[PDB]
Amino acid sequence: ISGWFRSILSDKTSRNLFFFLCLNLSFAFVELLYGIWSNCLGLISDSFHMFFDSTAILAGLAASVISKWRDNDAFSYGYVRAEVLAGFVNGLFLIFTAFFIFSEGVERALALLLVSILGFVVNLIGIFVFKHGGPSRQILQGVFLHILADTLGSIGVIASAIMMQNFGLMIADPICSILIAILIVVSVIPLLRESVGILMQRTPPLLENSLPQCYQRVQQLQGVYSLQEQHFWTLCSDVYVGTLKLIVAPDADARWILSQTHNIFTQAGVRQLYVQIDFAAM
Amino acid sequence: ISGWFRSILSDKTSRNLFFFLCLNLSFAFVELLYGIWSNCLGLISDSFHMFFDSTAILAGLAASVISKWRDNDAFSYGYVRAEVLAGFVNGLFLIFTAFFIFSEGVERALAPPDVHHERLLLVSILGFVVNLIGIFVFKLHILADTLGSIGVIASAIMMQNFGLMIADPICSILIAILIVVSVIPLLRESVGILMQRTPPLLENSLPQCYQRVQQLQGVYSLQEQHFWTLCSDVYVGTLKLIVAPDADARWILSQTHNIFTQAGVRQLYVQIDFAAM
């Protein structure tokens, strides 16, 4: 337990996520107190929602912590798919919070501004700190998307609060809600697509275009007859696993062919390669 | 579309499963409209429960029809991971609904809505009847959804005999806890498959396979053994063998393939490296 925290502070993304966790629960206590201070009209709901947000941040932090673990017999590849799974569940949570924004808009449908300013300062701190989001490339992408969704949703609710006061429109809140949900869903689509591609054992998109030339280079090797059962997939970000079977001549140089195939697929970016070499009868 | 309708009305097992769906979605609509009508949060939570159970079934059919597709260059293994992903996604969605209705239940327990509209206040024993007949007549989730309807059973009795407003939130949190408990095992299996974990049905026989491969003549060591689950009962295994400078690579390859095929591995890649000395 004591050494768990030192591993957390050693890792940059983990320490930033713990910064966010501590800040989120501190402001949660503050706003819960302000909530039970005789103002529980809609803020109790807001309190519970940013508890959900803190849960998502905790999911990202836990994903990083498990990702830096050591492999064993049960988890021979490690726990490096935890970042991909976190990105996936964070994208799905963003879809669900888009649905919740839609429900909030439908709460009005056809028929004081102080928790939101601290939410705004929290979320601009998030934009500043997590600018490099764009195990970092998968966890920080989902965390950046979640923080952006909360950021721009709070922006939308403040836009509603400022339109009903300055010019007195009663329709802008549902329309800003549908704009809000549509924009965050459109933003979260690419991360879900990449996560689904990784978890479906799809060929890595960066590796996909360079693979036919790699197969041509392997087929050009002296004494190789055919390539079979070539499978490439993404383990984690920028780690590709590849397998293929080679039918070679009955007297082919298996050492040289193995070394050349490994070289060819190493220049392409395949970290883990398994080449089975089968000697032909004829 | 004409051929589809006649076929599904003549078979038997498909007829029972489509009865399962159509009745379940129908009463999901009815009890959702009753819940949004009055203040039955617990009832709309139960509606979300068996709504997502019906989506689990129909997403199972959709994932089956997707995994029937032929593999291409991009998807080398095919679309067989679609069933695992669909189960995982629906489990996550059930978790999310459980958490949100937990939140709304605590909010309702803070201040009770005091609506208690009756009308056909007996929608709840209709829900009990329908999920009983669904789970028995048709085909831990085999009995978890039975406990979901009993939550609104006592809420309606408490919502009539004394009108105690604390009951409906308590049923909402109880339903949420039941949902997460029911969903946990499927999520565990899906997480294990998607994390490239060694298949549990293969883990106990793997040390014996390693000892058998090591006993092969000319084999020096086993390195970088990786086994994972592609889909149900389809295991992919990779390993690298360091062998003698003059070992029988053909025989060693055949014996390693036999050893791991007897253990249940369907896709095996054995890389053989000849030692310098």
Epitope: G223, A249, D251, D253, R255, M282 | -
Partner: antibody
């Protein structure tokens, strides 16, 4: 008993074709690759090509447009056809059995001297 | 391609002594622990005879006085002791890269 015999024309007119037959004994062409190497006083030992057990041919990129190697497993013969013979092609042409599972060549024929002149 | 440079072009060594022939490769002929370099011996009016394959493995039936060593780009053929029948030309051949290329050749001259 592993023995390779090359039989070809000693004299070849310039810009004509050179055809050498390598007859093997003591091993089968069904599981052995045969290389072709020429040795000249100027350019030394030059590797030309190899025919594999299934008929796959790999050639030197300098001769790819004018070289062709074929074989027939029934009579255990390998056929070496070269076109556009020029004055720099005077060399002793060997057919060599590839050392099994290695990139070397363990058995060589005696070699046929080929003189390209008018 | 890979250019193999043999030094010296000619070597004079007396009886019962050690002779050293070096082959230098333009690019590395190593792959995953194996050095795809082969040594041949060609006597007068004879086809080349393989001595060492993969830079340290004696061909079956060659005398134990022939030795090979080296890796990456630098390789050494060592004859110890040097006999009278070792009067021949020694070639290094690489097989790491297509096309196969041979060394320039080193003539071992027997001093008497």
């Amino acid at each position: 008993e592993v023995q390779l015999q090359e039989s070809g024309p000693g004299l070849v007119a310039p810009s004509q074709s050179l055809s050498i037959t390598c007859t093997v004994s003591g091993f089968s062409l069904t599981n052995y690759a045969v290389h072709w190497v020429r040795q000249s006083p100027g350019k030394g030992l030059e590797w030309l090509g190899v025919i594999w057990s299934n008929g796959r041919t790999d050639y030197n990129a300098a001769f790819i447009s004018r070289l062709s190697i074929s074989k027939d497993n029934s009579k255990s013969q390998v056929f070496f056809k070269m076109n556009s013979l020029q004055a720099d092609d005077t060399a002793i042409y060997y057919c060599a059995r590839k050392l099994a599972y290695e990139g070397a060549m363990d058995y060589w024929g005696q070699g046929t001297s080929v003189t390209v002149s008018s | 391609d890979i250019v193999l440079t043999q030094s010296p072009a000619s070597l004079a060594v007396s009886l019962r002594r050690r002779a050293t022939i070096s082959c230098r490769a333009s690019e590395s002929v190593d792959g995953y622990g194996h050095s795809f370099m082969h040594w041949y011996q060609q006597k007068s009016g004879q086809p080349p005879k393989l001595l060492i394959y993969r830079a340290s493995n004696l061909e079956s039936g060659v005398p134990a006085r022939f030795s090979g060593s080296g890796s990456r780009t630098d390789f050494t053929l060592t004859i110890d002791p040097v006999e009278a029948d070792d009067a021949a030309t020694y070639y290094c051949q690489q097989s790491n890269e297509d096309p196969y290329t041979f060394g320039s050749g080193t003539k071992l001259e027997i001093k008497r």
